Amino acid sequence: FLCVPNLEGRWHVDGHTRSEGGNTWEGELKIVQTWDKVRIHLKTKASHSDSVTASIIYDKGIGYQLLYNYRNGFAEFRFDADLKSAEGHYFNGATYGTMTITRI
């Protein structure tokens, strides 16, 4: 079997910039997925960012993780077992923060 997770669609993003006076922000994430190829568009208040490179990994006991870089940095998400939501973090080289992703 050659199985991959179905992460495609729209997710609500509850981000928290823990870097240099950041406030709790919100946004919308769009994941366009063709098998292994994955693209991530993040539309927020301050325009948007589009992914450049990405990769899906699976680590047993932890679950599925999505690592990617984007162009307004790095972002990574860790999804729950049934792909409902994900906890991630991002770093722009300097800002950084923690995001929560929720499918809808």
Next chain:
Amino acid sequence: FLCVPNLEGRWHVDGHTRSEGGNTWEGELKIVQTWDKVRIHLKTKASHSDSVTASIIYDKGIGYQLLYNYRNQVGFAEFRFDADLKSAEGHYFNTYGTMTITRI
């Protein structure tokens, strides 16, 4: 989730034309696979048989079926894999018969 069976590799083919006449022939099948995109190539000591369009389908109860239109040197061949993709039984139609393939 998105899964396909891993059918790639070489397979031995015990073929038998069920038309009037013929006998037990043999061949080698090479299955090249990129996700759901599959290309079959059958080579024997008489004539080789390449494929054009191929589709993987899964029906509840049967398992994973592989159906493709081919071309010697347009016919239709199909297999139904069993036992964790180690062996499959199928038939072809251009001269008609069956084929029993085993994954090397």
